[PDB]
């Protein structure tokens, strides 16, 4: 019985591979050779954030690209004003080991989570102006690795138990459960229309899920090691995945195949955080060599190098308008990088 | 300066002084990571340190020794895959790794886990405190004689008791030889790599002895001192 099912699964995998080969006629790099190269890119540190006590684990930008939220292992969640460097709020965290944080699109709530397996959401617009624990979400049997808001009452969270959950803030209970991963889910990326989200797990796999329906749509296994970061293309028809194999891979939802591979001989360390620009022309990926690399999304060439972090870069975020890029590192310093003419 | 800007500046100053107070509290408190197998007596040690005082995910215990606060963190509910979240503990003061010395069959698993955590990329600069727990059970098992470590570890046949050993006066020499064989087996793995940036502190724990926490205290003190000796390049 089991052998027959395994043989059928192998035959279906072979059929899928044959279909992928048939639908693949030309490489992406072959047709992008006629475009003008981006060239060398140099970015300067416009702002530096200081005040955290431990390593920065994750950060998220606001809708207005003015206030950002930073999470550190010291048990403090700090809101930073990117313009005047002034601190807006310093929320004490009951669990010091926080691995992810999220900022609501409306800016009224902020979420965090980590090894405690509890998603804590605080309201930033209280009547008396004092931050308090608005909601606590429980039910995950693993460390919370990434959380992203969908609206003022719904949130999507991912944990290490190979399971993703959809939480309603008003009720506090799970409404949709996504299962199918074999390794720990590291990060997820929301589509611009908030209809689909693709999440990568620690099995060299990335799966696309529908929030409203609640089942997997496409599965991509082009990587060789655990995928740590994932970002969504602005058009919503593609995404990029970074893994420990020192290689970024671009996948297309409609093509159901990898588009381009970003790797070099001089880089051999893992990839922690990846993100796209406003137009998606450049892919910024932070590595374990204490810096980040900006690659050309089309020609697969190292467009630029962002160095100046004393430790590994843990989180990388790009503003909605693309004004600047915020990179957090384990040295307890968050640096804002931007280009100039 | 605008009135709203001045209000923002004064609020930022209040946040800064709150963060300074939090930093002063944080620097005076040390953090420890507890690791061990399910059959190990980690729960007994946690219970003892909690009672003496001197879904859930992670458990935190606070205990004060010699007017020094220590926060010990234990894994409450996590999967068997520990290759990712362990990186969260790259800045802890010490890692207490408890090993059950009574289970010879699972001793190889403990050795493999110790080697994996010792050679981790993000745990290179973190010292590990080794507790060879269940000493009484190991002594009883050795005295029984039904099972011998030679079958599990052939190297025990050629092993010899170290000259610098300090056995208990009323302890059988065979038990001392076995426990020091286990200790040297751990020490060879610990010294195989590391280059002296981090150190191991193998201690024999009875899972009921009160000194254990104090031992950790002393160990942590040494670590801090060694850290200072690494600031002046004295080691």
């Amino acid at each position, epitope marked *: 019985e089991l052998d027959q099912l395994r043989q059928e699964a192998e035959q279906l995998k072979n059929q899928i591979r044959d279909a992928r080969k048939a639908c693949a006629d030309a490489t992406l790099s072959q047709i992008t050779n006629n475009i003008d190269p981006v060239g060398r890119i140099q970015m300067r540190t416009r702002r530096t954030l200081r005040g955290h006590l431990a390593k920065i684990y994750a950060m998220h930008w606001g809708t207005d690209s003015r206030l950002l939220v930073s999470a550190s292992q010291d048990g403090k969640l700090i809101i930073w004003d990117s313009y005047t460097t002034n601190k807006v709020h310093a929320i004490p965290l009951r669990s010091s080991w926080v691995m992810t944080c999220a900022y609501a699109p409306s800016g009224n709530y902020v979420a965090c989570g980590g090894l405690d397996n509890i998603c804590s959401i605080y309201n930033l617009k209280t009547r008396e102006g004092n931050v308090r624990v608005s909601r606590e979400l429980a039910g995950h049997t693993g460390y919370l690795s990434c959380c992203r808001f969908l609206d003022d009452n719904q949130i999507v969270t991912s944990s290490g138990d190979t399971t993703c959950a959809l939480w309603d803030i008003e009720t506090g209970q799970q409404t949709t459960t996504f299962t199918g991963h074999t390794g720990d889910v590291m990060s997820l990326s929301l589509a611009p229309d908030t209809r689909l989200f693709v999440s990568g797990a620690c099995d060299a796999s990335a799966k696309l899920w529908d929030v409203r329906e609640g089942m997997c749509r496409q599965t991509f296994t082009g990587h060789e090691s655990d995928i740590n970061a994932i970002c969504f293309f602005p058009n919503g028809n593609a995404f990029a995945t970074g893994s420990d194999d020192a290689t970024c891979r671009l996948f297309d939802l409609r093509a159901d195949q990898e588009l381009m591979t970003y790797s070099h001989d001089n880089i051999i360390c893992g990839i922690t955080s990846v993100s796209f620009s406003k137009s998606g022309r450049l892919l910024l990926a932070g590595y374990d060599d204490f810096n980040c690399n900006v690659w050309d999304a089309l020609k697969a060439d190292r467009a630029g190098v962002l160095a100046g972090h004393d430790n590994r870069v843990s989180c990388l975020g790009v503003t909605d308008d693309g004004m600047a890029v915020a990179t957090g590192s384990w040295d307890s310093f968050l640096k804002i990088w931007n280009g100039s003419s | 300066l605008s009135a709203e800007d001045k209000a923002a500046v004064e609020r930022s100053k209040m946040i800064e002084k709150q963060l300074q107070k939090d930093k002063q509290v944080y620097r005076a408190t040390h953090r420890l990571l507890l690791l061990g197998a399910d059959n190990s007596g980690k729960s007994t040690i946690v219970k003892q340190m909690r009672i003496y005082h001197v879904t859930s995910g992670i458990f935190e215990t606070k205990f004060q020794v010699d007017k020094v606060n220590f926060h010990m963190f234990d894994v409450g509910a996590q999967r068997d895959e520990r*290759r990712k979240w362990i990186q969260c503990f790259n800045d802890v003061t010490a890692i207490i790794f408890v090993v059950d010395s009574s289970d010879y069959n699972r001793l*190889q698993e403990a050795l493999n886990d110790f080697k*994996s955590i010792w050679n981790n990329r993000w745990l290179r600069t973190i010292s590990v405190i080794l507790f060879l727990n269940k000493q009484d059970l190991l002594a009883e098992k050795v005295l029984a004689g039904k099972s011998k470590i030679e079958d599990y570890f052939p190297e025990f046949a050629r092993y010899t008791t170290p000259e610098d050993a300090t056995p208990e006066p009323g302890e059988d020499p065979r038990v001392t030889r076995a426990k020091y064989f286990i200790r040297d087996e751990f020490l060879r793995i610990s010294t195989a790599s590391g280059d002296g940036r981090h150190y191991c502190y193998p201690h024999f724990t009875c899972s009921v002895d009160t000194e254990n926490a104090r031992r950790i205290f002393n160990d942590c003190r040494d670590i801090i001192q060694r850290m200072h000796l690494r600031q002046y390049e004295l080691l």
Partner: nanobody, 128 residues
């Protein structure tokens, strides 16, 4: 897709010789460290032996030390395991596991029961 296929096994008389082969595809074999795991009936996964990228550092567990030999061939992209002087206690299913990360000296979740970077394994029964 990263996959590993194991060949060799079955019924073997005690004290005989056996050859286990593993073919891995979907990744660079020369980059990752290789491990062998065994699952006995009624017992959990236990580490057996490991070989590094270049084969300079090869280690075995104390149970089968001096009895099993593990080698790799990068040109043919394969792994070989020669077993001699088998015992009835060695009746188990063999899995070939890959290091989770490249260019690293530590294996963390190789013995994990839910590890994904391993093959299906083959059954070896040492019976008379």
């Amino acid at each position: 897709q990263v996959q590993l296929q194991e060949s060799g096994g079955g019924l073997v008389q005690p004290g005989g010789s056996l050859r286990l082969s593993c073919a891995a595809s979907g990744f660079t074999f020369s980059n990752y460290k290789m491990n062998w795991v065994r699952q006995a009936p009624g017992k959990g996964l236990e580490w057996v032996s490991d070989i590094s990228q270049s084969g300079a550092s090869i280690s075995y567990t104390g149970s089968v030390k001096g009895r099993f030999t593990i080698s790799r061939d990068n040109a043919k992209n394969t792994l070989y395991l020669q077993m001699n002087s088998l015992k009835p206690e060695d009746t188990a299913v063999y899995y070939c596991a890959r290091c989770p990360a490249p260019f690293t000296r530590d294996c963390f979740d190789v013995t994990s029961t839910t590890y994904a970077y391993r093959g299906q394994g083959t059954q070896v029964t040492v019976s008379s």
